[PDB]
Amino acid sequence: MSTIYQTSATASAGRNGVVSTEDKLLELNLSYPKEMGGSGTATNPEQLFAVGYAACFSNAILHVAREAKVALKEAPVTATVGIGPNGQGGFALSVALAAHIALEDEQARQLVTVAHQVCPYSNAVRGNIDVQVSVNGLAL
Amino acid sequence: MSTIYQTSATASAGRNGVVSTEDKLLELNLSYPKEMGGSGTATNPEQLFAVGYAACFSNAILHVAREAKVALKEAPVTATVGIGPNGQGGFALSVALAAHIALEDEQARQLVTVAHQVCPYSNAVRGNIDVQVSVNGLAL
Ligand SMILES: [Zn+2]
Ligand SMILES: [Zn+2]
Ligand SMILES: [Zn+2]
Ligand SMILES: [Zn+2]
Ligand SMILES: [Zn+2]
Ligand SMILES: [Zn+2]
Ligand SMILES: [Zn+2]
Ligand SMILES: [Zn+2]
Ligand SMILES: [Zn+2]
Ligand SMILES: [Zn+2]
Ligand SMILES: [Zn+2]
Ligand SMILES: [Zn+2]
C-alpha cells in the first residue's frame, strides 16, 4: 500500500493521435491498425498492453526465480493481446502469455504459477481476463 | 467474443532489457527508474500502462460521445499509474484517470461513467484496481 514509483501520461485524441509521458521518455503516435480501418503506420493500446505485460511477466518470472535461488539467464515471454466487442456495448481484451524457462517442465510450471500471483499486471486483470498461460510450449 | 485485432510482443529480460512487438512498430529499451535503483534513461511497464490507458480511455470518451451524438474536438485524459508492494509477496498497480470534457459538469460525468463501462482497459481491471476517476478537476 506504499508506492515505490508512479508516473503519468496524457492523451487527448484517443486511438488516433499522440500520447506521451509527463517526463517525455515515451512519446508516441497512435493510429488504428489496418484491421480497424487505419493506416497501420503507428502503434495502439493493444500493442502497449502486450509490450508492458510481456516485460512485466518476464520480470515476475525473474523475480520469483531469484527469490527461490534459481539462477536464470533469461525468461522469454510472448504476450498476445486481442480486442473485440463484448456484446454489452463495449470491448474486452483477451490475453495469452507464452512463458519459457530453461528448466524441467514441472519446475517451470511452479515458477510461472507463482509469478502469475506476484505480477502486478496479472493482479490487475485476474477474474476479468482469463489469461491463457503456456509454459515451454505446453499449457500451464 | 469475436476478435477484431490482435498483436504479440516479446520480452526476455524483464524490466531491464529490450521488448518489441512482432511487427516492430514498437521497439523499446526498458530500465528501472531512479526510484527503483536504475538509470531512469529508459521506460518501464508502469509508463506503458499509463500511456495505453490514457489513450484508450480518451478514446472511450470520444466513442461514447460520438454514439450519443455529442460533438467533441478532444478528450484530454491524464492517467497516473503507481506500483507498490501488496503485502502478499507481490505488487499491485494504482490508477487515477483525470478526464476532461468541454461540457457542463454533469453531462461530462455521465459520459465518463459510460466510457468507464465500455473501455476494455477499465473492463480488464474492474474490481481489482480501484481506479480513481476525476472529471473536469472534480471527483467523478
Ligand atoms: Zn495489422
Ligand atoms: Zn510483472
Ligand atoms: Zn523484483
Ligand atoms: Zn535461453
Ligand atoms: Zn513458446
Ligand atoms: Zn498445470
Ligand atoms: Zn524517476
Ligand atoms: Zn478504451
Ligand atoms: Zn470506437
Ligand atoms: Zn479543448
Ligand atoms: Zn485535470
Ligand atoms: Zn459522481
UniProtKB/TrEMBL annotation, chains A, B:
Enumerate the residues binding Zn(2+) 1.
35
Q: Which SUPFAM superfamilies match?
A: OsmC-like
- Keyword Metal-binding in record: yes
Q: Which residues bind Zn(2+) 5?
A: 100
> Which residues are involved in binding Zn(2+) 4?
74
Query: Keyword Repeat on this protein?
Result: no
Which Gene3D superfamilies does the entry link to?
2.20.25.10, 3.30.300.20
Q: Which UniProt keywords apply?
A: Metal-binding, Zinc
Record: residues binding Zn(2+) 6: 140
Question: GO MF annotations for this entry?
Answer: metal ion binding
The regions listed as transmembrane in this protein's record are none
Recorded family membership: Belongs to the OsmC/Ohr family.
Name assigned to this protein: Organic hydroperoxide resistance protein, putative
Name the species this protein comes from. Answer: Vibrio cholerae serotype O1 (strain ATCC 39315 / El Tor Inaba N16961)
